[PDB]
Ligand binder design. Structure first.
Ligand SMILES: Cc1cc2nc3c(=O)[nH]c(=O)nc-3n(C[C@H](O)[C@H](O)[C@H](O)COP(=O)(O)OP(=O)(O)OC[C@H]3O[C@@H](n4cnc5c(N)ncnc54)[C@H](O)[C@@H]3O)c2cc1C
Ligand SMILES: *[C@@H]1O[C@H](CO)[C@@H](O)[C@H](O)[C@H]1NC(C)=O
Ligand SMILES: *[C@@H]1O[C@H](CO)[C@@H](O)[C@H](O)[C@H]1NC(C)=O
Ligand SMILES: *[C@@H]1O[C@H](CO)[C@@H](O)[C@H](O)[C@H]1NC(C)=O
Ligand SMILES: *[C@@H]1O[C@H](CO)[C@@H](O)[C@H](O)[C@H]1NC(C)=O
Ligand SMILES: *[C@@H]1O[C@H](CO)[C@@H](O)[C@H](O)[C@H]1NC(C)=O
Ligand SMILES: *[C@@H]1O[C@H](CO)[C@@H](O)[C@H](O)[C@H]1NC(C)=O
Ligand SMILES: O=Cc1ccc2c(c1)COCO2
Length: 514
């Protein structure tokens, strides 16, 4: 039911082409925009029966070898964004540094590798009529390709012992399920540290039916009884290209929380007063495109143990309904990995350190995506998350930070203290330590020291922009499948859900059509 350790499988490169190739232009059964977490498994699934074009703005992961190992994770965030790199840097209007992927495989090529299935209650909360047996079969299809049971890592075992001592019960052992308590979960990093990612799911596609264009920047959805008929995309030289769908085929947007609402607005799908104010012709009025955009808060402390600890990838989770906690151990660095700390002016560690983290669930706070340019998709849109605008989110951070307090007080973490004193002032901290234990100091700490968890979602919600089949309401032959679709996180680590969702919706399209 799980993958083995093995090299990153690039066999699919036999059907990957440069978008400069004009022989890609023409008619397909399906066009999928964004070769990411959802887009890759979706395109692979549709290609079992139909001719599919997958368009990805980034290049291939072979160009950036530091994307293919666990110990390259920080390198990709440290690297300057020259417009070509797998990591695109942005800053939310809240002032918090963030990143998104620009690469075939999408955010699975740059992420922290943690694999989990959705909270099994999530499906019924959505009110979508899911095929739940098919959901589970689709999880196994992903897991069998790219997920391993992780090997023991000393720092992760310390943290898991600490979560258990701090009252994060029960002990769930090794499990992929989002459940209360402490567990070892799966990883898309194998036991040799090789990264596995959504691009490898292209290997499950039919190589006679699937074509992938890289460095393909999709600029516009073309429309006809309003129907999507195609896309315009530009290549890395700046020349324009067109592709179309035929007969009962469909265009699917899988361009992510940021890319999907951006392309919909650029194509005239969006709020009538907003688009009219930019002189963008309205093709389909919908007041919710780019609305309900969410970023779960990351709050953290950093400890500097007096003896070196061994670097680890996150595999051990401490889950409560109101906070989701993990820790990674890291080598020091002299270039900050962009967005690990919320600004570039954060003190850098001189020794090995443990990043100890809590994630707010939901979140309930939301903002929006708006266009920066009314014409050029390569210009990043504006994004604002309104961190802690909702007081329930602030209340949940307070609970998380008190639990990190309990964690630092465990026998498990005592050996990582610099001074054998009774209190948590015995640790050496990088940045702001935890507080005083009245609510007000914990609130200040939460508000002042917030970072992105990187699990941002929304902007094209089911119930707002889409129906229960992921169709853009009012438009034939157009769907959206990616993290733009749900307002609340399906779990602590949603890559597993969006990998599954790509294939699941592909199977629903194939069934609808049969
Ligand atoms: C640094 C980081 C670490 C993370 N760690 C974890 C973790 O360990 N585990 C976990 O579960 N989750 C993690 N996440 C979250 C998870 O990886 C993402 O939520 C998920 O991958 C999003 O999938 P998506 O398909 O919505 O977007 P993406 O995977 O980003 O796919 C969208 C794709 O569309 C492309 N694109 C965008 N616009 C266009 C356009 N106009 N034309 C063509 N292509 C376009 C992009 O280049 C990209 O490849 C992490 C996120 C980040 C940023
Ligand atoms: C596509 O071709 C152009 C030259 O026309 C080149 O500059 C670019 O690097 C190529 N991209 C890829 C992904 O091969
Ligand atoms: C799906 O798998 C989960 C564990 O991830 C299990 O709890 C659940 O019962 C399964 N549901 C169905 C419909 O098989
Ligand atoms: C939209 O175009 C009208 C002219 O038709 C102009 O008066 C107005 O300033 C334009 N607005 C923008 C933002 O371009
Ligand atoms: C799972 O989701 C359900 C319903 O939304 C919620 O009651 C529960 O708290 C969640 N479980 C965990 C451990 O997050
Ligand atoms: C576009 O982005 C710039 C620089 O990030 C920002 O400050 C400016 O206000 C934005 N312009 C529009 C039209 O949104
Ligand atoms: C927070 O979200 C809740 C539930 O979704 C919403 O009803 C409420 O208006 C928000 N609260 C605040 C403090 O804005
Ligand atoms: O950049 C290196 C690094 C160090 C610690 C860490 C993470 C990344 C992700 O989050 C959790 O902890």
């Amino acid at each position: 039911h799980l993958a083995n350790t093995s090299a990153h499988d690039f066999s699919y490169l036999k059907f990957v082409y440069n978008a400069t190739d004009t022989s890609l232009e023409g008619s397909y059964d399906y066009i999928v925009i964004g070769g990411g977490t959802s887009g890759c498994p979706l395109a692979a699934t549709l290609s079992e029966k139909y001719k599919v074009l997958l368009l990805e703005r980034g290049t291939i992961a072979t160009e950036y070898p530091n994307t293919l190992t666990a110990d390259g994770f920080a390198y990709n965030l440290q690297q300057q964004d020259d417009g070509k790199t797998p990591v695109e840097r942005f800053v939310s209007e809240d002032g918090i540094d963030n990143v998104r992927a620009r690469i075939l495989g999408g955010t699975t090529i740059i992420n922290a590798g943690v694999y989990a299935r959705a909270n099994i209650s999530f499906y019924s909360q959505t009110g979508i009529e899911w095929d739940l047996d098919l959901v589970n079969k689709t999880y196994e299809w992903v897991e069998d390709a790219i997920v391993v049971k992780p090997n023991n890592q000393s720092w992760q075992s310390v943290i898991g012992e600490g979560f258990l001592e701090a009252g994060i019960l029960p002990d769930n052992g090794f499990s992929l399920d989002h459940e209360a308590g402490t567990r070892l979960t799966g990883s898309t990093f194998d036991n040799n540290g090789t990264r596995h990612a959504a691009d490898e799911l292209l290997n499950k596609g039919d190589p006679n039916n699937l074509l992938v264009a890289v460095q393909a920047s999709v600029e516009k959805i073309l429309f006809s009884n309003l129907s999507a008929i195609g896309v315009i995309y530009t290549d890395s030289d700046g020349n324009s290209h067109q592709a179309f769908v035929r007969g009962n085929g469909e265009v699917i947007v899988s361009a992510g929380t940021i890319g999907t609402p951006q392309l919909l607005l650029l194509s005239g799908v969006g709020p009538e007063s907003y688009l009219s104010s930019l002189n963008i012709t309205v093709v389909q009025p919908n007041p919710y495109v780019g609305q309900f955009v969410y970023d779960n808060p990351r709050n953290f402390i950093n400890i500097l143990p007096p003896n070196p600890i061994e670097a680890s990838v996150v595999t051990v989770l401490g889950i409560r309904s109101d906070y989701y906690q993990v820790s990674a151990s890291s080598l020091p660095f002299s270039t900050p990995p962009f967005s690990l700390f919320p600004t570039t002016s954060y003190p850098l560690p001189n020794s090995t350190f443990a990043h100890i983290v809590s994630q707010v669930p939901g979140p309930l706070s939301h903002g929006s995506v708006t266009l920066n340019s009314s014409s050029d998709v390569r210009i990043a849109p504006n994004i604002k998350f309104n961190y802690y605008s909702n007081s329930t989110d602030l209340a949940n951070c307070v609970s998380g930070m008190k639990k990190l307090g309990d964690l630092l007080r465990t026998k498990a973490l005592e050996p990582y203290k610099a001074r054998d004193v009774l209190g948590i002032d015995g640790f050496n901290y990088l940045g702001v330590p935890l507080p005083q234990t009245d609510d007000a100091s914990f609130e200040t700490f939460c508000l002042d020291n917030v970072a992105s968890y990187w699990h941002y979602h929304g902007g094209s919600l089911v119930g707002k922009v889409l129906d229960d089949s992921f169709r853009v309401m009012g438009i034939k032959a157009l769907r959206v499948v990616d993290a733009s679709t749900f307002p609340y996180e399906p779990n602590s680590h949603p890559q597993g859900f969006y990998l599954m969702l790509g294939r699941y919706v592909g199977l629903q399209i194939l069934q609808e059509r049969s």
